[PDB]
């Protein structure tokens, strides 16, 4: 509410990412690994 | 060219850009704003229970439009804009809606912010465009919500990005007071407090008439129950006046909140009547709310 | 093209291969794409005729006083242009830039108008918000084109008045093309840098705040010399009232010395406003001269008004 | 009835008369010439072709040609043709272009923009003193600065000092500093611009300061003029937080506004009226002087002032028979002029409601308590007592 | 004013190499979609006729950290900057093609350019030390009149938080005061009076003990 | 800056706490001093709230520091209490040591000293109170009136106005009063004080309080009857005055 | 700037700002002039009447410190009350201890030692004054072994001996004239009229005896504060002197 | 919709987003509007004086006026949930 | 308010009569730009304009 608006713009893209990987369940044959590189952002991924 | 004037839209023809016809229609997002919201069908009778509030807004707003004669002779100047104030939930938007029906003038509601339009970019100097479009379609009864219940400190500011929304707020005032021709422009405001207000919205020539809409009395509340039941199914044994005394509401919408809850019980059981017992259970739902807000002021206070 | 579509274009009807080359304007057909007649060089004379202007009539004797600062400001700009002889023999190359700072109402504007008159060379009036003429990246080519035109002349002053836009400062939070706001700031400063040693392309800057100034720009050898200007001391005040009052009708055997003791520290501009206001009191009185008394009132009104904004009250309201 | 009739007689007959003669004469202009003034009309109509585009004159080129910039993206190479000579045109002037083959017709736009129509006022205020209720000293000061040099330069000659270059109005909210400015604007018989200060501010790169510059451009040509810019706390130096578009905008507009106002030889005869309501957000480089050359404080009415505002307003309200003016002004303390304006409108309103064809004492006293509620502070005897 | 520009130019002299200089406002020209051709063109030349140094100065507007400040064509400029770094990583051993970069503040500099081993070794030039200050005044002085009554150690102690840029101005200033008086030979005294006219302070104002 | 303590001097050379103390003075009640040549009259405005406030058990704005020195005050009502108490213990300490009635001059310097003490140190604010101290000297009949300010500067003034809207009383007082010929009789002196307070009270003679201090240690506080009697005479002559301008204008 | 609120507390120049600011308090005050002559030191002052209800000759701007040390003052009279008292005590205890008339030089130092307390705690003299003082003095007297001296006490604790010194608003202007108007061969009647010539020019009102108050240190007369009848006579003789010229 | 998704990307961007969302509900009406988090959005009061804090307020002023309706919508009015009970109290919404 | 109200009604009629002049005045105009001696240059200009090299 006083952080940078830059991070806010690019937030949306991940919300389309997160919802997409859902189609793979509950076939476990295909799997997703994610690696963070910033403690500055807090991703809506950690949340869900 | 005499049948033309500067800043009058005009239609053109082919790629010559020969003049075709004259456009007396002017397409703006100001207009689309009002177009979703329509002309409202709240009537005075539904705000019946308090007719004093209805009586002061009529005198100030409506009566000088229809009959300027009285105030050009007996008084001096058209009576100035009103600001509706009172506790939360009394019925302050409801009143504005009702007045709009009865006057039969062009309203230019215009919801809770104006920064909701970014089709031509953000209103920084298009706020003034509102007055022009209104003046043409005269009378210009304007309604505006800046409820301002939030931020106990906000009046000392002079500002950061407070400044953008203040520049919008300010330019309204200059245009209103104007320079100096008017076409009976009247601004009804609805707001939560005047202590918690947008800085320099009221100063005090603008807007120096004030209408208070109080917390209802039991004598007021009985009438509010009465009319909501006439649409519904009456109380059996006609105890609709009797329940009013047992709990007084603290708003007009709390009075409404009893009836909706009461007739909900009739929905569970699927009966075609309502009774006294239904009305009594219903008051107790409304009280839960006053309790949820303040409870720690009885334990661990001072 | 100025359509910004690109073409290989045919020959003309009298064109020479020895006239049309890189960097030359040419005209071609608007639908057929063939050179027929070439066009004149350059494309900057549209902005540059208005920015340059001839000489105002102010003299470096009003500019008030006869301060040490005025003397030193003349050394940086005027003396080397007039005479480089001293500078080479001492073994210095002149300071390239100079900063005009001090509280607003000190008369850095009197300085810009005066140095134009003295110089007998071209003086460019440039406003910082006439270099922002953005159509998205157009405003940057304004800074570039105007600078380049000075660097073609040799012995010239470019003067920027109250930069804070284009010569601004950096953000890390900006919006709407605040990068292009940076790009225009930084465009100015690089061209400056690059030409050094230039000799005789001298830059003056008037700033009302030196902290709304880029820290890259502020770095010396764009801006090697810096002069601080101040509220004139009592003597400098006394002098300046006499210039203005020479023009007015006044009392012979009057005390201008008295008016300066009365007046406290104050903007040099507002010192000019005393003489005007004093005159106002003579005007409504219908008197054809201005007494010692009415100047007393004229200070009193300006100062007493100004106190309203900043620091009120005295203890000599009873004492 | 006789006084109205006397004015009404003269103004209706002549104006109605001026109207009728314009009708007859308008036909009659045409018959004298038919080949003696007609010739210029025929040659223009043919060259123009009727459709025309604008161009801006980039520069001249020596051989009776020129180069122009279209509002579309390409520039074009034009020839200077027709009646309009190239000593009537300089770079920086707008030109008309011919459709088929772009050609310099002449100029007739004369750097018009839709913002000039906005600057330009046509509406005339009431307004003169005797509709301004008191503040004798305040009336005087704005008249000597803004009205007076234009009407009488004689005093300014004799003394031999330059005339005030502006004035700044500031004080409490709702004081009616606006009447005085309007009054200056009516009486002068001078071209009155303005504008609101919230109209120079936009969000588009570099358009804002150019709108600031434009006001002076129109005033300097049609000088002497007076420019009234309202609300300068919409164009102050104030914070702007972070992640905002408007943070640059506010900075640039103000900067351009500053240079033009001071001049570099100045307009030299255009005075300005600035009005404002917050002086704790005003920039410091606009209230130091050569800009403005008085600064004046307005304060809320007192007893003598109130009685005057009141005095004018009650004479325009019928039958104050049992109404004593003095007894109301005595009790009233610390109110604006806005509040007394309001009390007359409210008191008439209560007289209507009473089912009474006239005002009373009791109509006025009730209205008075109401408006005291609105403007009240009590921490004076709260702290003390 | 720490003397980055200096050191990169010099670096190139030693190695006798093809020196290309670029600066972030220079790089952008005309329509911003034509900005991307220029980066590519530059690097086409450079890699040929090696050794080389491609030195990109002051990156504060085509290497912004924020993506909020609107750019659409200057974005493609960042991307075509990125190809170059990639092809250094593309040689394994990138001896032939060396790149240098400079910026005024690295906080403003883009995080993805530093991220990973896309670019290696970050080198911070501090404020001159006492040692470094003594050397910087002397060299400039050589150009004007030089006298050995000047004790350069005395000067280096006094200055606090001074850059080499700031000291060049002191050297030049010492010359301005000296010429003013008319002494055709500089003193140490002149030099000491040159610290407090380059700095915005006034040390010329008498006090209650002066 | 520079008003955030008493210990910053500021470059404009004001100690703000003193400057701001003066604006607090305005909050209190008008007080007016006028000397004659056998009396000093010391009168003050008495604020009336409601009828539920008394004026019996409720403190007057005139307070006896002794039996020959008096004081009226303007400022925070809270502040003034301790100012008066400390001044009073000094007035008695003076007879304890010397055995003399206090000197008027000695007393005023003591009260200005207390305000000055507070003002110099930063551990306290000063008393935000200006007072006028009237009295007569131990054995001389020479009338004395002195004024103090929060700053702890005292002066002697023949007549002075402090409190709420002090300036508008000052200009009327300046005109009518002479130091060439002050009032010979207590009765005209009293009425001049009444005339000064007439302006600022508007309605009421129950908002004007009169006390007189005379030589030989006489202090008397005058009755509501006598004050009502003075105000009515002023009211009659003023009514008459209006008529005379109306005649005179017609007459010429 | 941002280094100025405290009194401890420096300052990139090296000066105590609080101390320098008290210099500026002295210019707020009314003009006071002193001129040493070999026949005595004349301390004249200006008084300013805000109303012609402020009784001029009950405000004191010249005060007696002893029978041979006098002071004139300018600045805050709040600060002058403590400042003066200290010095009155100094002269009286010196006569008690040594019987000898206090030396002017030492009497200054006592004032200026008291001026030095700024802090709220130090090593050595223990500081108990919360701020610098806001009052200057001109200190005038006569000692037996150095004759007549005129000193200026500063609130900054430094003392400059002078032949003549002005403080107050009209300090700059008086100082300018006195640069052209002091001599070895001036005399006390001459001094007296010298002070008034300088005074009229630097007073905003006009020269009257109500708004003037001169005084002398003569070994014979001791410290003598004048009257307005006396002061008026001198005024009438100044005007005669300027008439001839 | 979410409360993490109701943010200011620009000054005055917050309120633009609300109006789009409640128009859209009307377009596809009947429809149920769900806001997951209104625990950050609704807060009783502040001690603040930045337009940063005003972005948060204007969502709530907009939220209120829009809910209400003027079309007298065939929607099933706003469903909202909050983990807390003490920043979104029935004196900010209320009573029906 | 009949005695004076009558005269007020006539004043609004006057406002419309002045408006009718604004329209009328525009109905015939006479204009011309350039100068009269440049008439020969127009003649030239048609030959260049018609032509194609621009
Ligand atoms: N006085 C009344 N008579 C009858 N019904 C009422 C009355 N007041 C409110 N209502 C009903 O209760 C509903 C809810 O009103 P609510 O309390 O939410 O109102 P508001 O004062 O416009 O609010 P806000 O300040 O949040 O904008 C109204 O929409 C209306 O249907
Ligand atoms: N030293 C001076 N002597 C005489 N008149 C002066 C002096 N200083 C200022 N003025 C007068 O004040 C006017 C206004 O000040 P001026 O515009 O010169 O100031 P500045 O410091 O350059 O301001 P900004 O910060 O707005 O660029 C001058 O045009 C001139 O009349
Ligand atoms: N002296 C007066 N005589 C007559 N009417 C008055 C007087 N003073 C106030 N008024 C009335 O009250 C209104 C109050 O002034 P207004 O609201 O226009 O504010 P302002 O302080 O002049 O505003 P801004 O800062 O926006 O320019 C006046 O326009 C007028 O209608
Ligand atoms: N360390 C140094 N030794 C010698 N001279 C120096 C040194 N540092 C700075 N200078 C002098 O100061 C001048 C200006 O500094 P310079 O332009 O080199 O700064 P920079 O750190 O490269 O700049 P930017 O951050 O703007 O790219 C140099 O030309 C040189 O004369
Ligand atoms: Mg509502
Ligand atoms: Mg300037
Ligand atoms: Mg106004
Ligand atoms: Mg560099």
From Swiss-Prot, chain B:
> Which positions does UniProt annotate for ATP binding?
86-93
Keywords from the UniProt entry: Acetylation, ATP-binding, Cytoplasm, Nucleotide-binding, Nucleus, Proteasome
The UniProt PTM text for this protein says: N-acetylated by NAT1.
GO BP terms: namely: chromatin remodeling; nonfunctional rRNA decay; nucleotide-excision repair; positive regulation of RNA polymerase II transcription preinitiation complex assembly; positive regulation of transcription elongation by RNA polymerase II; proteasome regulatory particle assembly; proteasome-mediated ubiquitin-dependent protein catabolic process
Where does the record place it? Answer: Cytoplasm; Nucleus
For molecular function, the Gene Ontology terms on record are: ATP binding; ATP hydrolysis activity; proteasome-activating activity; protein domain specific binding; ubiquitin protein ligase binding
Superkingdom of this protein's organism: Eukaryota
Cellular component terms, GO, for this chain's entry?
A: nucleus; proteasome complex; proteasome regulatory particle, base subcomplex; proteasome storage granule
Entry annotated with the keyword Nucleus: yes
Q: What does this protein do?
A: The 26S proteasome is involved in the ATP-dependent degradation of ubiquitinated proteins. The regulatory (or ATPase) complex confers ATP dependency and substrate specificity to the 26S complex.
Subunit structure as annotated in this protein's UniProt entry: May form a homodimer or a heterodimer with a related family member. Interacts with OLA1, TMA17, and UBR1.
Further details from the record: Present with 4700 molecules/cell in log phase SD medium.
Q: Which family does it belong to?
A: Belongs to the AAA ATPase family.
What is the name of the protein in this document? Answer: 26S proteasome regulatory subunit 8 homolog
- This protein's species is Saccharomyces cerevisiae (strain ATCC 204508 / S288c)
Q: Which lineage is the organism of this entry classified under, starting from the top rank?
A: Eukaryota, Fungi, Dikarya, Ascomycota, Saccharomycotina
Curated annotation (Swiss-Prot), chain C:
Per UniProt, the keywords (alphabetical) are: ATP-binding, Cytoplasm, Nucleotide-binding, Nucleus, Phosphoprotein, Proteasome
The main location is cytoplasm
Post-translational modification, as annotated: The N-terminus is blocked.
Residues recorded with modification Phosphoserine: 16, 83
The entry marks the following residues as binding ATP, namely 102-109
Give yes or no: UniProt keyword ATP-binding: yes
Gene Ontology terms describing biological process = positive regulation of protein catabolic process; positive regulation of RNA polymerase II transcription preinitiation complex assembly; proteasome regulatory particle assembly; proteasome-mediated ubiquitin-dependent protein catabolic process; ubiquitin-dependent protein catabolic process
One GO cellular component assignment for this chain's record is: cytoplasm
Origin superkingdom:
Eukaryota
Provide the protein's localization: Cytoplasm; Nucleus
Recorded GO terms, molecular function?
A: ATP binding; ATP hydrolysis activity; proteasome-activating activity; ubiquitin protein ligase binding
What other note does the entry give for this protein?
A: Present with 105 molecules/cell in log phase SD medium.
Q: Subunit composition?
A: Interacts with UBR1 and CIC1.
**Similarity field:** Belongs to the AAA ATPase family.
Q: Describe the task this protein carries out.
A: The 26S proteasome is involved in the ATP-dependent degradation of ubiquitinated proteins. The regulatory (or ATPase) complex confers ATP dependency and substrate specificity to the 26S complex.
Q: What is this protein called?
A: 26S proteasome regulatory subunit 7 homolog
**What is the scientific name of the source organism?**
Saccharomyces cerevisiae (strain ATCC 204508 / S288c)
Q: Which residues of the full protein are shown?
A: 149 to 467 of 467
Curated annotation (Swiss-Prot), chain E:
- Coiled-coil-forming residues are none
Role: The 26S proteasome is involved in the ATP-dependent degradation of ubiquitinated proteins. The regulatory (or ATPase) complex confers ATP dependency and substrate specificity to the 26S complex.
Tell me what PTMs the record reports for this protein. N-acetylated by NAT1.
Question: Where does the record place it?
Answer: Cytoplasm; Nucleus
Name listed for the protein in its UniProt record: 26S proteasome regulatory subunit 6A
Q: Which family does it belong to?
A: Belongs to the AAA ATPase family.
Instruction: Give the binding site residues for ATP.
Output: 1-5
Instruction: State the organism named in the record.
Output: Saccharomyces cerevisiae (strain ATCC 204508 / S288c)
Membrane-crossing segments per the record: none
Lineage: superkingdom = Eukaryota
From Swiss-Prot, chain F:
Gene Ontology CC: one annotated term: proteasome storage granule
Q: Which SMART domains match?
A: Proteasome_A_N
Which UniProt key words apply to this protein?
Cytoplasm, Nucleus, Phosphoprotein, Proteasome
> Which positions make up the signal peptide?
none
Tell me the residues on which Phosphothreonine occurs: 58
Segments forming a coiled coil: none
Tell me where it mainly resides. Answer: cytoplasm
Q: According to the UniProt entry, which residue ranges have a biased composition of type Basic and acidic residues?
A: 235-246
The record's annotation in InterPro entries points to: Ntn_hydrolases_N, Proteasome_alpha, Proteasome_alpha-type, Proteasome_asu_N, Proteasome_bsu_CS, Proteasome_sua/b
What GO biological process terms does the UniProt entry carry, in alphabetical order? proteasomal ubiquitin-independent protein catabolic process; proteasome-mediated ubiquitin-dependent protein catabolic process
Q: Give the intrachain disulfide bonds.
A: none
Subunit (UniProt): The 26S proteasome consists of a 20S proteasome core and two 19S regulatory subunits. The 20S proteasome core is composed of 28 subunits that are arranged in four stacked rings, resulting in a barrel-shaped structure. The two end rings are each formed by seven alpha subunits, and the two central rings are each formed by seven beta subunits. The catalytic chamber with the active sites is on the inside of the barrel. Interacts with CIC1.
Name the family.
Answer: Belongs to the peptidase T1A family.
What NCBIfam families does the record point to? PRK03996.1
Question: What is the recorded name of this protein?
Answer: Proteasome subunit alpha type-4
Q: Which organism is it from?
A: Saccharomyces cerevisiae (strain ATCC 204508 / S288c) (Baker's yeast)
The primary gene name is PRE6
């Amino acid at each position: 509410s006083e952080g940078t608006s830059a991070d806010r713009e690019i937030q949306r893209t991940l919300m389309e990412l997160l919802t997409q990987m859902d189609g793979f369940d509950n076939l476990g044959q295909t799997k997703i690994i994610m690696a963070t590189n910033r403690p500055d952002t807090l991703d809506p991924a950690l949340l869900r | 060219v005499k049948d033309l004037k500067a800043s009058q839209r005009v239609c053109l023809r082919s790629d010559s850009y020969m003049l075709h016809k004259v456009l007396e229609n002017k397409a703006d997002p100001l207009v689309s704003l009002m177009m979703v919201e329509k002309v409202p069908d709240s009537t005075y009778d539904m705000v019946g229970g308090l007719t004093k509030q209805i009586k002061e807004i009529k005198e100030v707003i409506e009566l000088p439009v229809k009959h300027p004669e009285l105030f050009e002779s007996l008084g001096i100047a058209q009576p100035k804009g009103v600001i509706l104030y009172g506790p939360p939930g009394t019925g302050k938007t409801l009143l504005a809606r009702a007045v709009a029906h009865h006057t039969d003038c062009k309203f230019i509601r215009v919801s809770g912010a104006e920064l909701v339009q970014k089709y031509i970019g953000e209103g920084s100097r298009m706020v003034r465009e509102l007055f022009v479009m209104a003046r043409e379609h005269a009378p210009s009864i304007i309604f505006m919500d800046e409820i301002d219940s939030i931020g106990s400190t906000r009046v000392e500011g002079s500002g950061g990005g407070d400044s953008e929304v203040q520049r919008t707020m300010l330019e309204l005032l200059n245009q209103l007071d104007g320079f100096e021709t008017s076409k009976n422009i009247k601004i009804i405001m609805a707001t939560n407090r005047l202590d918690i207000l947008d800085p320099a919205l009221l100063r005090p020539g603008r807007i120096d008439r004030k209408i208070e809409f109080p917390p209802p009395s039991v004598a007021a509340r009985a009438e509010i129950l009465r009319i909501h039941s006439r649409k519904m199914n009456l109380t059996r044994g006609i105890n609709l006046r009797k329940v009013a005394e047992k709990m007084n509401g603290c708003s007009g919408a709390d009075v409404k909140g009893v009836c909706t809850e009461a007739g909900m019980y009739a929905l569970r059981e699927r009966r075609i009547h309502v009774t006294q017992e239904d009305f009594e259970l219903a008051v107790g739902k409304v009280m839960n709310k006053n309790q949820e807000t303040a409870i720690s002021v009885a334990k661990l206070f001072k | 093209l100025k359509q910004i579509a690109k073409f290989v274009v045919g020959l003309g009807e009298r064109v020479s291969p020895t006239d049309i080359e890189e960097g030359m304007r040419v005209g071609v057909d608007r639908s057929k794409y063939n050179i027929e007649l070439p066009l004149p060089p350059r494309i900057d004379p549209s902005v540059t005729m208005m920015t340059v202007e001839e000489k105002p009539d102010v003299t470096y004797s009003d500019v008030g006083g006869c301060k040490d600062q005025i003397e030193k400001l003349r050394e940086v700009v005027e003396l080397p242009l007039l005479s480089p002889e001293r500078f080479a023999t001492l073994g210095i190359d002149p300071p390239k830039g100079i900063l005009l700072y001090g509280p607003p109402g000190t008369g850095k504007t009197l300085c810009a108008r005066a140095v134009a008159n003295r110089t007998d060379a071209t003086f460019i009036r440039v406003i910082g918000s006439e270099l922002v003429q953005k159509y998205v990246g157009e405003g940057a080519r304004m800074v570039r084109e105007l600078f380049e035109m000075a660097r073609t002349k040799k012995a010239c002053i470019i003067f920027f008045d109250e930069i804070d836009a284009v010569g601004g400062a950096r953000f890390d939070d900006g919006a709407g093309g605040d990068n292009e706001v940076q790009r225009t700031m930084l465009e100015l400063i690089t061209q400056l840098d690059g030409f050094d040693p230039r000799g005789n392309i001298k830059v003056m800057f008037a700033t009302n705040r030196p902290n709304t100034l880029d820290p890259a720009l502020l770095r010396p050898g764009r801006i090697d010399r810096k002069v601080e200007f101040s509220l004139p001391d009592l003597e400098g005040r006394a002098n300046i009232f006499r210039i203005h009052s020479k023009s007015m009708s006044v009392e012979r055997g009057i005390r201008w010395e008295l008016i300066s003791r009365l007046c406290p520290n104050s903007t040099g501009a507002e010192l000019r406003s005393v003489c005007t206001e004093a005159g106002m009191f003579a005007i409504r009185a219908r008197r054809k001269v201005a007494t010692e008394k009415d100047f007393l009132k004229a200070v009193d009104k300006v100062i007493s008004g100004y106190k309203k904004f900043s620091s009120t009250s005295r203890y000599m309201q009873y004492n | 009835t006789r006084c109205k009739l006397k004015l009404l007689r003269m103004e209706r007959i002549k104006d109605h008369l001026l109207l009728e003669e314009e009708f007859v004469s308008n036909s009659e202009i045409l018959k004298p010439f038919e080949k003696k003034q007609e010739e210029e009309k025929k040659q223009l109509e043919e060259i123009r072709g009727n459709p025309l585009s604008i161009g801006t004159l980039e520069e001249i080129i020596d051989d009776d040609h020129a180069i122009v910039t279209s509002p579309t993206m390409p520039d074009y190479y034009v020839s200077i043709l027709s009646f309009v000579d190239k000593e009537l045109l300089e770079p920086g002037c707008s030109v008309l272009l011919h459709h088929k083959t772009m050609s310099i017709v002449g100029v007739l736009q004369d750097d018009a923009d839709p913002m000039v129509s906005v600057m330009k006022m046509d509406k005339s205020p009431t307004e003169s003193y005797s509709d301004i209720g008191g503040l004798e000293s305040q009336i005087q000061e704005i008249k000597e600065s803004v009205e007076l040099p234009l009407t009488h330069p004689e005093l300014y000659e004799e003394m031999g000092i330059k005339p005030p270059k502006g004035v700044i109005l500031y004080g409490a909210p709702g004081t009616g500093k606006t009447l005085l400015a309007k009054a200056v604007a009516n009486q002068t018989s001078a071209t009155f611009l303005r504008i609101v200060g919230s109209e120079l501010i936009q969000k588009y790169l570099g358009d804002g300061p150019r709108l600031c510059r434009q006001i002076f451009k129109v005033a300097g040509e049609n000088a002497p003029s007076i420019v009234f810019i309202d609300e300068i706390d919409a164009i102050g130096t104030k914070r702007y937080d972070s992640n905002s578009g408007g943070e640059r905008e506010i900075q640039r507009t103000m900067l351009e506004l500053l240079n033009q106002l001071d001049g570099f030889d100045d307009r030299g005869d255009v005075k300005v009226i600035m009005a404002t309501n917050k002086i704790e957000t005003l920039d410091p480089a606009l209230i130091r002087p050569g800009r403005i050359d008085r600064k004046i404080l307005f304060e809320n009415p007192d007893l003598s002032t109130k009685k005057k505002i009141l005095g004018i307003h009650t004479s325009k309200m019928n039958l104050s028979e049992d109404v004593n003016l003095e007894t109301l002004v005595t009790t009233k303390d610390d109110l604006s002029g806005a509040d007394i304006q309001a009390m007359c409108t409210e008191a008439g309103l209560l007289a209507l409601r009473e089912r009474r064809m006239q005002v009373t004492a009791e109509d006025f006293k009730q209205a008075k308590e109401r408006v005291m509620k609105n403007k009240v502070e009590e921490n004076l005897e709260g702290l003390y007592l | 004013g720490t003397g980055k520009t200096l050191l990169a130019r010099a670096c190139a002299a030693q190695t006798n190499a093809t020196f290309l200089k670029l600066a972030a406002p220079q790089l952008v020209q005309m329509y911003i979609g034509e900005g991307a051709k220029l980066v590519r063109d530059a690097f086409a030349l450079a890699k040929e006729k090696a050794p080389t140094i491609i030195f990109i100065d002051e990156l504060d507007a085509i290497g912004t950290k924020r993506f909020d400040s609107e750019k659409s064509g200057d974005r493609e400029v960042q991307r075509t900057m990125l190809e170059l770094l990639n092809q250094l990583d593309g040689f394994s051993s990138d001896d032939r093609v060396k790149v240098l970069a400079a910026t005024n503040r690295v906080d403003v500099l883009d995080p993805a350019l530093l991220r990973s081993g896309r670019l290696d070794r970050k080198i911070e030039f501090p404020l001159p030390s006492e040692d470094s200050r003594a050397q910087i005044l002397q060299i400039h002085s050589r150009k004007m009149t030089t006298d050995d009554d000047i004790n350069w150690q005395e000067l280096a102690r006094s200055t606090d938080e001074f850059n080499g840029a700031q000291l060049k101005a002191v050297t030049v200033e010492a010359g301005m005061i000296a010429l003013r008086n008319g002494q055709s030979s500089v003193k140490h005294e002149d030099f000491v009076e040159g610290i407090s006219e380059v700095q915005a302070r006034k040390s010329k104002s008498v006090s209650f003990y002066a | 800056g520079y008003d955030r303590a008493l210990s910053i001097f500021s470059p404009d050379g004001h100690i703000f706490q003193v400057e701001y103390a003066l604006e607090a003075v305005k909050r209190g009640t008008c007080a007016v001093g006028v000397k004659g040549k056998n009396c000093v009259v010391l009168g003050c405005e008495r604020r009336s709230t409601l009828k539920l406030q008394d004026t019996r058990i409720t403190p007057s704005k005139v307070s006896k520091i002794d039996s020959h020195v008096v004081l009226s005050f303007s400022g925070l009502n809270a502040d003034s209490r301790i100012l008066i108490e400390k001044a009073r213990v000094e007035a008695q300490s003076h007879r304890l040591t010397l055995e003399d009635p206090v000197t008027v001059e000695y007393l005023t310097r003591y009260v200005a000293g207390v305000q000055q003490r507070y003002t110099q140190s930063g551990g306290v604010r000063p008393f935000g109170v200006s007072t006028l101290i009237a009295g007569f000297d131990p054995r001389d009949d020479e009338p004395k009136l002195y004024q103090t300010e929060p700053s702890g500067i005292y002066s002697s003034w023949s007549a002075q106005t402090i409190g709420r809207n002090s300036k508008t009383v000052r200009e009327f007082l300046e005109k009518n009063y002479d130091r060439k010929e002050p009032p010979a009789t207590v009765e005209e002196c009293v009425k001049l004080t009444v005339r000064s307070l007439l302006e600022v009270v508007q309605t009421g003679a129950k908002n004007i309080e009169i006390t007189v201090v005379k030589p030989d240690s006489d202090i008397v506080a005058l009755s509501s009857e006598e004050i009502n009697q003075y105000v009515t005479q002023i009211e009659q002559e003023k009514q008459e005055q209006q008529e005379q301008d109306k005649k005179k204008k017609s007459n010429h | 700037s941002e280094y100025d609120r405290g009194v401890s507390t420096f300052s990139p120049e090296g000066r105590l700002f609080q101390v320098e600011y008290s210099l500026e308090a002295i210019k707020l005050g009314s003009t006071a002039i002193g001129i040493a002559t070999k026949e005595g030191v004349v301390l004249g002052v200006e008084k300013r009447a805000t109303s012609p209800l402020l009784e001029s000759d009950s405000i004191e701007k010249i005060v007696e410190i002893d029978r041979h040390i006098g002071c004139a003052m300018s600045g805050l009279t709040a600060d002058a009350r403590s400042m003066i008292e200290h010095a009155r005590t100094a002269a009286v205890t010196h006569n008690l201890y040594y019987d000898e008339d206090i030396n002017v030089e030492s009497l200054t130092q006592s004032v200026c030692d008291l001026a030095l307390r700024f802090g709220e705690g130090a090593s050595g003299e223990e500081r108990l004054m919360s701020r610098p003082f806001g009052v200057a003095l001109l200190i005038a007297g006569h000692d037996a072994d150095d004759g007549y001296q005129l000193f200026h006490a500063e609130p900054s604790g430094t003392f400059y001996r002078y032949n003549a010194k002005a403080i107050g608003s009209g300090s700059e202007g008086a100082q300018a004239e006195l640069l052209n108007e002091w001599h070895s061969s001036l005399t006390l009647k001459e001094a007296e009229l010298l002070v008034l010539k300088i005074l009229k020019q630097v007073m905003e009102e006009k020269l009257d005896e109500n708004n003037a108050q001169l005084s002398c240190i003569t070994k014979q007369d001791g410290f003598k504060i004048y009257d307005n009848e006396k002061t008026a006579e001198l005024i009438k003789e100044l005007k005669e002197k300027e008439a001839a010229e | 919709v979410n409360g993490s998704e109701f943010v200011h990307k620009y000054l005055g961007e917050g309120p633009r987003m609300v109006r789009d969302v409640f128009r859209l509900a009307r377009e596809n009406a009947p429809s149920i509007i769900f806001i997951d988090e209104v625990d950050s959005i609704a807060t009783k009061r502040f001690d603040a004086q930045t337009g940063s804090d005003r972005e948060v307020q204007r969502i709530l002023i907009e939220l209120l006026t829009q809910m209400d309706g003027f079309d007298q919508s065939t929607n099933v009015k706003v469903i909202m949930a909050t983990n807390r009970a003490d920043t979104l109290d029935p004196a900010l919404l209320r009573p029906g | 308010a009949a005695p004076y109200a009558a005269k007020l009604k006539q004043t609004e009629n006057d406002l419309k009569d002045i408006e009718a002049r604004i329209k009328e005045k525009a109905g015939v105009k006479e204009s011309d730009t350039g100068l009269a001696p440049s008439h020969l240059w127009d003649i030239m200009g048609d030959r260049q304009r018609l032509g194609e090299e621009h």
